[PDB]
Amino acid sequence: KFPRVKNWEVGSITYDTLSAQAQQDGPCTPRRCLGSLVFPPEQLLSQARDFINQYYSSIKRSGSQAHEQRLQEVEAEVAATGTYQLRESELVFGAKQAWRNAPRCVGRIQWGKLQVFDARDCRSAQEMFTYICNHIKYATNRGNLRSAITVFPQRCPGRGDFRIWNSQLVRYAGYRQQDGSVRGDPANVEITELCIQHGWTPGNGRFDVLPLLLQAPDEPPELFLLPPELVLEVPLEHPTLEWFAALGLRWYALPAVSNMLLEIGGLEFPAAPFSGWYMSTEIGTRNLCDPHRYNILEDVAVCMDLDTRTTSSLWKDKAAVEINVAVLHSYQLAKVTIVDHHAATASFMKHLENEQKARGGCPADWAWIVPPISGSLTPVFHQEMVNYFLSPAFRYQPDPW
Amino acid sequence: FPRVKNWEVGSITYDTLSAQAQQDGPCTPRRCLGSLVFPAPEQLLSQARDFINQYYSSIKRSGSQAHEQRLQEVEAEVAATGTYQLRESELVFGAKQAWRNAPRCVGRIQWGKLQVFDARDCRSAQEMFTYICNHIKYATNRGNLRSAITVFPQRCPGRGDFRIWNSQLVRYAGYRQQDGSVRGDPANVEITELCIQHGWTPGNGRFDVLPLLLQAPDEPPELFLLPPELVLEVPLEHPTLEWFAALGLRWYALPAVSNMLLEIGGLEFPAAPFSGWYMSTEIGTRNLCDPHRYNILEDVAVCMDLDTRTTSSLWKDKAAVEINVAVLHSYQLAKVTIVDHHAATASFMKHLENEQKARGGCPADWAWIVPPISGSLTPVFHQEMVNYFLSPAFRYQPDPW
Ligand code: HEM
Ligand code: HEM
Ligand SMILES: C[C@H](O)[C@H](O)[C@H]1CNc2nc(N)[nH]c(=O)c2N1
Ligand SMILES: C[C@H](O)[C@H](O)[C@H]1CNc2nc(N)[nH]c(=O)c2N1
Ligand SMILES: Cc1cc(N)nc(CCCN2CC(F)(F)C2)c1
Ligand SMILES: Cc1cc(N)nc(CCCN2CC(F)(F)C2)c1
Ligand SMILES: [Cl-]
Ligand SMILES: [Cl-]
Ligand SMILES: [Gd]
Ligand SMILES: [Gd]
Ligand SMILES: [Zn+2]
């Protein structure tokens, strides 16, 4: 009744008693496992009591005066208004816990260090842009990246909502041709089409930084040229392959997800961008080598004069490793926070041991924690993991169209 | 009906075969346990009935005279004897379907090409050993490997099982050491202790081939040494790094799993060893580089002059790539069948397309299908998969000791 979890490298066993708190049902049934799939009125009082109890237990103040008090005012707020406002300290606690509960994040060893900006009195895209711009420069911090989340107003009935129409705050463009294919990033060919449609002059480059499309409630989105000084980017060069610089590759410093719905205590924030710092396989393996992304793998292999005529030469594996080397080398010479996948997974193993002592386990999505190159060379590969949904949480949400 | 996406191409299929999945798996809507390694005549009747239905569908004779004859016959024999006997053609189809149904096997493009050896008339451990020697010889075929299975008598009321105590037919010894360590393969310390306990005179090399421990019904296990010239081995060398041959590493040609139970229409064969050929990553990455196996990675990177003081140099990844290069080149030099992870995952993609057209789906365990290096460089990384249990099946079973 409590899942037995083994680590096959060392042979240690733990039990995930924490999984007994799984709220939102997952996709799996005894008949079939769906773990490999990417996207698989007064109910607000159940989700709020549980959250407020979470807060006070975590400050050793369960079951004492201040706990009762906070229970009544949310009772009376929703009674009067049909929703409630979070205290500053609660929202801070809610933000850090959602990160801590994100089963796909390998960087949660950092969950306790999180800078929370409160944009709950926001109104109009003119202010949105400023709140985002405060975040970006704070998080970027001239290359010493700092984790941050900005929280725009929550959701109320009978009124439109705040949304960042882009998936991230920094994304490159994707342009079709006289032949359908793409110059730039193929992942963003849709939002790129929206920006052009909404009044932005298309560029001629593989690495044009898209403009933001920000949406105040019930009003049509507005384009916003991000200040180029605010967008810190890293030209890519290799330590010893002098020609690599010539391939003209860049990536941007700050990975800032802007499309996920933060959910705290039954309250929903459709705009709540969080940012951290990249793990290098994200950029070098996925962004640049995925066949449907920049798909640079064979071009780096020609430059290395590899045998691309036979798969058993492992030319793919070789080119990919050096691409990752160039990424790490480039972020370090530019002095931008980045972590390699060996350091990151080792830290996650340390995270799991922390969490086992602290909360009785940790929800983890094996298919996403295990890096996309050299999987079984990292210790998470040999760690069994239990996936489930805890609250508060980051959730995916529809696109607003 | 679960919907399944390929993220490299965009295509979408629905896995309707999943609806027929019989025995239940480890996951619930509360929590996924996909990453875990090791998760009455009337039911015998119902299992058998369904298998017979399958077999008569496969010969394009569903609902014919022969079909009802067999259904009625099996109830008769279960009524009279508590069990029944497979016809030979049924046993060949059921061994093939069992491979076909194995969710963790990436080599299933070959499932129809399988050589079925009927040893259900076997009587002793000594006759068992001769059947096994003939399997190894046929399958090895002087380095031109052929897929085979040998099927020993089924579990039955009144008598104990046949069992092969070794987990594979070819395995290297693992001796505990003077300072707690293991010389040889640490995966095989238990079975090495059992061979010694049963009169085997141990060696002291790192690549000592283990003898067979064979269990006849209601007998102690009997020890059998494999004829040296029956076990084709491959010395490992690297096509450019000449110092690599001085590591003295070898692996054997034939991967023959022998501790799994074959289930066909409710009948159980606890002894039914099967073999194919290796994918290069099993040897190069897992068997040689796992920290709890031969653990050669650091020593190779030192020889390569890599800088092992910092993870960010990707010395682990670079050293592993060459070990796989070495495995592939050595088996081609020796003219021993081998497939790399790029070819193998590309054939597994064709298997999923063939299987979609033929059965409406295909069971697959993503975390086992994706190679342990260069995961997202193969096409199976970007393929969602549904995992479930079909019969006939190979199943794990406890050790007989
Ligand atoms: C501080 C350094 C951080 C690192 C190194 C890191 C690393 C990663 C990586 C590699 C992924 C896999 C995502 C993918 O491959 O698409 C991920 C997922 C995720 N992370 Fe983090 N992260 C960091 C900070 C954060 C922060 C600050 C938050 C929120 C407060 C966060 C929340 C999430 C969420 C919600 C996901 C799942 C997103 C998805 O599935 O698309 N992470 N993280
Ligand atoms: C002919 C070439 C074959 C290739 C390239 C191949 C490939 C593989 C690989 C790479 C694995 C994962 C192994 C691991 O990581 O330990 C696997 C598992 C498996 N294969 Fe295949 N295989 C082949 C033949 C066969 C045959 C002939 C059968 C049965 C008739 C079979 C049944 C299985 C089963 C049951 C598993 C799961 C083993 C386990 O979970 O312990 N395979 N295979
Ligand atoms: C189909 C497959 O589950 C899917 O491509 C997943 C696998 N693991 C992943 N892991 C990470 N970190 N990011 C991803 O996008 C994916 N994709
Ligand atoms: C815990 C984890 O599931 C375990 O280490 C698995 C992962 N995937 C695997 N995949 C294959 N093919 N073989 C394995 O041994 C494993 N080990
Ligand atoms: C906070 C954070 C840190 C990090 N190191 N990396 C990311 C990547 C998130 C991008 N993911 C791809 C997607 F679109 F699915 C979302 C986010
Ligand atoms: C037939 C076959 C083919 C192949 N290519 N590889 C294997 C190895 C399977 C070994 N697996 C490790 C375990 F013990 F879990 C079982 C078997
Ligand atoms: Cl990204
Ligand atoms: Cl093996
Ligand atoms: Gd040249
Ligand atoms: Gd050389
Ligand atoms: Zn599952």
Tab-separated table of N, CA and C in Angstrom, chain B residues 270-348:
chain	number	residue	atom	x	y	z
B	270	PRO	N	8.283	-22.921	-17.130
B	270	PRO	CA	9.281	-22.173	-16.356
B	270	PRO	C	10.695	-22.309	-16.897
B	271	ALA	N	10.919	-23.172	-17.886
B	271	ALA	CA	12.229	-23.324	-18.507
B	271	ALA	C	12.023	-23.238	-20.017
B	272	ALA	N	12.352	-22.075	-20.596
B	272	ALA	CA	12.210	-21.862	-22.035
B	272	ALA	C	13.184	-20.775	-22.484
B	273	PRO	N	14.487	-21.078	-22.466
B	273	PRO	CA	15.503	-20.067	-22.803
B	273	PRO	C	15.400	-19.607	-24.250
B	274	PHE	N	15.614	-18.308	-24.458
B	274	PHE	CA	15.572	-17.708	-25.788
B	274	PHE	C	16.780	-16.789	-25.985
B	275	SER	N	17.146	-16.586	-27.253
B	275	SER	CA	18.324	-15.823	-27.618
B	275	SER	C	18.080	-15.087	-28.935
B	276	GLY	N	18.742	-13.933	-29.084
B	276	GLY	CA	18.797	-13.192	-30.336
B	276	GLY	C	20.227	-12.755	-30.620
B	277	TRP	N	20.451	-11.473	-30.918
B	277	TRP	CA	21.794	-10.889	-30.948
B	277	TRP	C	21.805	-9.581	-30.161
B	278	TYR	N	23.000	-9.082	-29.867
B	278	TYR	CA	23.101	-7.910	-29.004
B	278	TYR	C	22.842	-6.621	-29.766
B	279	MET	N	22.274	-5.647	-29.060
B	279	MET	CA	22.408	-4.237	-29.411
B	279	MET	C	23.661	-3.691	-28.732
B	280	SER	N	24.432	-2.849	-29.439
B	280	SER	CA	25.775	-2.536	-28.942
B	280	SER	C	25.758	-1.842	-27.584
B	281	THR	N	24.698	-1.097	-27.269
B	281	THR	CA	24.693	-0.352	-26.013
B	281	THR	C	24.569	-1.238	-24.792
B	282	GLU	N	23.987	-2.440	-24.926
B	282	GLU	CA	23.896	-3.292	-23.746
B	282	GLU	C	25.280	-3.605	-23.235
B	283	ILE	N	26.195	-3.894	-24.155
B	283	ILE	CA	27.560	-4.238	-23.793
B	283	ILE	C	28.356	-2.991	-23.444
B	284	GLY	N	28.408	-2.037	-24.364
B	284	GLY	CA	29.303	-0.917	-24.188
B	284	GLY	C	28.894	-0.013	-23.049
B	285	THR	N	27.617	0.358	-23.010
B	285	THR	CA	27.136	1.247	-21.958
B	285	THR	C	26.826	0.488	-20.669
B	286	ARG	N	25.850	-0.425	-20.695
B	286	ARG	CA	25.380	-0.991	-19.428
B	286	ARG	C	26.382	-1.988	-18.858
B	287	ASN	N	26.689	-3.049	-19.606
B	287	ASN	CA	27.538	-4.093	-19.041
B	287	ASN	C	28.928	-3.566	-18.694
B	288	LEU	N	29.491	-2.685	-19.517
B	288	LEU	CA	30.852	-2.259	-19.230
B	288	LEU	C	30.949	-0.977	-18.403
B	289	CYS	N	30.013	-0.017	-18.543
B	289	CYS	CA	30.151	1.292	-17.895
B	289	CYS	C	29.306	1.522	-16.642
B	290	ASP	N	28.276	0.712	-16.392
B	290	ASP	CA	27.497	0.859	-15.164
B	290	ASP	C	28.420	0.815	-13.950
B	291	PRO	N	28.188	1.662	-12.943
B	291	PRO	CA	29.070	1.664	-11.765
B	291	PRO	C	29.057	0.358	-10.998
B	292	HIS	N	27.966	-0.394	-11.079
B	292	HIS	CA	27.804	-1.654	-10.374
B	292	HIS	C	28.067	-2.865	-11.260
B	293	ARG	N	28.513	-2.660	-12.490
B	293	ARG	CA	28.953	-3.739	-13.370
B	293	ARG	C	30.469	-3.626	-13.544
B	294	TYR	N	31.015	-3.681	-14.760
B	294	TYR	CA	32.464	-3.673	-14.923
B	294	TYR	C	33.079	-2.320	-14.590
B	295	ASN	N	32.327	-1.230	-14.734
B	295	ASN	CA	32.709	0.071	-14.196
B	295	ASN	C	34.031	0.580	-14.781
B	296	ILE	N	34.157	0.538	-16.109
B	296	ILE	CA	35.446	0.834	-16.732
B	296	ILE	C	35.564	2.286	-17.176
B	297	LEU	N	34.525	3.094	-16.964
B	297	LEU	CA	34.413	4.382	-17.636
B	297	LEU	C	35.557	5.312	-17.254
B	298	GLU	N	35.828	5.445	-15.955
B	298	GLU	CA	36.866	6.376	-15.541
B	298	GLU	C	38.208	5.926	-16.085
B	299	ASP	N	38.483	4.628	-16.005
B	299	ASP	CA	39.788	4.165	-16.445
B	299	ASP	C	39.993	4.418	-17.940
B	300	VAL	N	38.925	4.331	-18.734
B	300	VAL	CA	39.046	4.631	-20.159
B	300	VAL	C	39.302	6.123	-20.387
B	301	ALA	N	38.581	6.995	-19.667
B	301	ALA	CA	38.752	8.441	-19.832
B	301	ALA	C	40.144	8.893	-19.417
B	302	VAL	N	40.703	8.268	-18.380
B	302	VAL	CA	42.075	8.567	-17.983
B	302	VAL	C	43.031	8.250	-19.132
B	303	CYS	N	42.897	7.047	-19.700
B	303	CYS	CA	43.723	6.655	-20.838
B	303	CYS	C	43.574	7.624	-22.010
B	304	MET	N	42.341	8.034	-22.324
B	304	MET	CA	42.051	9.020	-23.373
B	304	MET	C	42.614	10.438	-23.066
B	305	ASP	N	43.310	10.665	-21.955
B	305	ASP	CA	43.802	11.974	-21.523
B	305	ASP	C	42.678	12.973	-21.248
B	306	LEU	N	41.431	12.528	-21.162
B	306	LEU	CA	40.362	13.453	-20.809
B	306	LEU	C	40.592	14.046	-19.419
B	307	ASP	N	40.028	15.219	-19.194
B	307	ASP	CA	40.133	15.872	-17.897
B	307	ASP	C	38.968	15.391	-17.049
B	308	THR	N	39.252	14.510	-16.090
B	308	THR	CA	38.212	13.912	-15.261
B	308	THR	C	37.939	14.703	-13.988
B	309	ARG	N	38.545	15.878	-13.832
B	309	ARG	CA	38.356	16.649	-12.611
B	309	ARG	C	37.061	17.446	-12.608
B	310	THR	N	36.462	17.696	-13.773
B	310	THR	CA	35.249	18.497	-13.873
B	310	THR	C	34.243	17.811	-14.788
B	311	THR	N	32.984	17.765	-14.351
B	311	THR	CA	31.960	17.094	-15.147
B	311	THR	C	31.709	17.819	-16.459
B	312	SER	N	31.930	19.140	-16.474
B	312	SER	CA	31.531	19.990	-17.592
B	312	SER	C	32.374	19.744	-18.838
B	313	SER	N	33.519	19.068	-18.708
B	313	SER	CA	34.262	18.645	-19.890
B	313	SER	C	33.601	17.490	-20.640
B	314	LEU	N	32.533	16.890	-20.081
B	314	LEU	CA	31.800	15.769	-20.686
B	314	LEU	C	32.710	14.578	-20.955
B	315	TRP	N	33.668	14.353	-20.048
B	315	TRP	CA	34.544	13.190	-20.152
B	315	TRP	C	33.771	11.887	-20.039
B	316	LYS	N	32.765	11.846	-19.173
B	316	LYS	CA	31.961	10.640	-19.090
B	316	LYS	C	31.351	10.317	-20.443
B	317	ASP	N	30.685	11.298	-21.065
B	317	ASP	CA	30.020	11.073	-22.345
B	317	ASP	C	31.004	10.720	-23.452
B	318	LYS	N	32.142	11.426	-23.528
B	318	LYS	CA	33.142	11.123	-24.555
B	318	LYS	C	33.721	9.724	-24.389
B	319	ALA	N	34.026	9.324	-23.148
B	319	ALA	CA	34.632	8.014	-22.919
B	319	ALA	C	33.671	6.884	-23.281
B	320	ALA	N	32.400	7.026	-22.906
B	320	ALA	CA	31.369	6.059	-23.242
B	320	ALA	C	31.186	5.919	-24.740
B	321	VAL	N	31.250	7.030	-25.488
B	321	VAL	CA	31.024	6.914	-26.925
B	321	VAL	C	32.060	5.980	-27.538
B	322	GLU	N	33.324	6.139	-27.139
B	322	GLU	CA	34.393	5.312	-27.693
B	322	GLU	C	34.256	3.844	-27.283
B	323	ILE	N	33.783	3.574	-26.061
B	323	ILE	CA	33.549	2.196	-25.644
B	323	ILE	C	32.533	1.537	-26.562
B	324	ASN	N	31.482	2.271	-26.938
B	324	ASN	CA	30.516	1.712	-27.871
B	324	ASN	C	31.109	1.553	-29.267
B	325	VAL	N	31.861	2.560	-29.743
B	325	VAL	CA	32.629	2.404	-30.977
B	325	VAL	C	33.432	1.115	-30.926
B	326	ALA	N	34.110	0.876	-29.806
B	326	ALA	CA	34.955	-0.301	-29.686
B	326	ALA	C	34.134	-1.592	-29.765
B	327	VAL	N	32.977	-1.631	-29.099
B	327	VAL	CA	32.124	-2.817	-29.158
B	327	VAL	C	31.683	-3.099	-30.587
B	328	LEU	N	31.179	-2.070	-31.278
B	328	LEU	CA	30.680	-2.255	-32.640
B	328	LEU	C	31.784	-2.754	-33.571
B	329	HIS	N	32.960	-2.139	-33.487
B	329	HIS	CA	34.055	-2.495	-34.381
B	329	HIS	C	34.583	-3.891	-34.080
B	330	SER	N	34.600	-4.258	-32.815
B	330	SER	CA	35.146	-5.556	-32.482
B	330	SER	C	34.246	-6.682	-32.988
B	331	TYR	N	32.923	-6.497	-32.927
B	331	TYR	CA	32.003	-7.546	-33.372
B	331	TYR	C	31.938	-7.622	-34.892
B	332	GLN	N	32.143	-6.495	-35.581
B	332	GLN	CA	32.247	-6.559	-37.033
B	332	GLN	C	33.568	-7.198	-37.453
B	333	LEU	N	34.666	-6.828	-36.789
B	333	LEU	CA	35.946	-7.489	-37.036
B	333	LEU	C	35.832	-9.003	-36.903
B	334	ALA	N	35.166	-9.468	-35.854
B	334	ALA	CA	35.017	-10.882	-35.550
B	334	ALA	C	33.913	-11.551	-36.359
B	335	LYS	N	33.130	-10.768	-37.113
B	335	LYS	CA	32.028	-11.270	-37.941
B	335	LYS	C	30.956	-11.925	-37.071
B	336	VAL	N	30.580	-11.203	-36.010
B	336	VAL	CA	29.513	-11.573	-35.097
B	336	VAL	C	28.427	-10.506	-35.199
B	337	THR	N	27.246	-10.896	-35.697
B	337	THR	CA	26.044	-10.061	-35.704
B	337	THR	C	25.990	-9.122	-34.501
B	338	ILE	N	25.626	-7.873	-34.755
B	338	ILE	CA	25.426	-6.857	-33.729
B	338	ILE	C	24.657	-5.713	-34.383
B	339	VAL	N	23.821	-5.001	-33.625
B	339	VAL	CA	23.087	-3.862	-34.171
B	339	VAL	C	23.331	-2.658	-33.268
B	340	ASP	N	23.502	-1.482	-33.875
B	340	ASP	CA	23.700	-0.298	-33.048
B	340	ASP	C	22.345	0.274	-32.639
B	341	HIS	N	22.359	1.208	-31.680
B	341	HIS	CA	21.098	1.756	-31.185
B	341	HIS	C	20.378	2.622	-32.218
B	342	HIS	N	21.087	3.201	-33.197
B	342	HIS	CA	20.408	3.982	-34.236
B	342	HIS	C	19.655	3.091	-35.223
B	343	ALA	N	20.326	2.084	-35.784
B	343	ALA	CA	19.632	1.084	-36.607
B	343	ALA	C	18.492	0.406	-35.842
B	344	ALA	N	18.735	0.020	-34.592
B	344	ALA	CA	17.741	-0.776	-33.861
B	344	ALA	C	16.493	0.040	-33.558
B	345	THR	N	16.671	1.279	-33.091
B	345	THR	CA	15.516	2.122	-32.815
B	345	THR	C	14.786	2.496	-34.096
B	346	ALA	N	15.496	2.611	-35.220
B	346	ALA	CA	14.831	2.869	-36.494
B	346	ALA	C	14.048	1.669	-36.987
B	347	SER	N	14.506	0.457	-36.685
B	347	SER	CA	13.692	-0.697	-37.040
B	347	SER	C	12.520	-0.838	-36.080
B	348	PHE	N	12.702	-0.444	-34.809
B	348	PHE	CA	11.572	-0.492	-33.894
B	348	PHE	C	10.472	0.476	-34.306
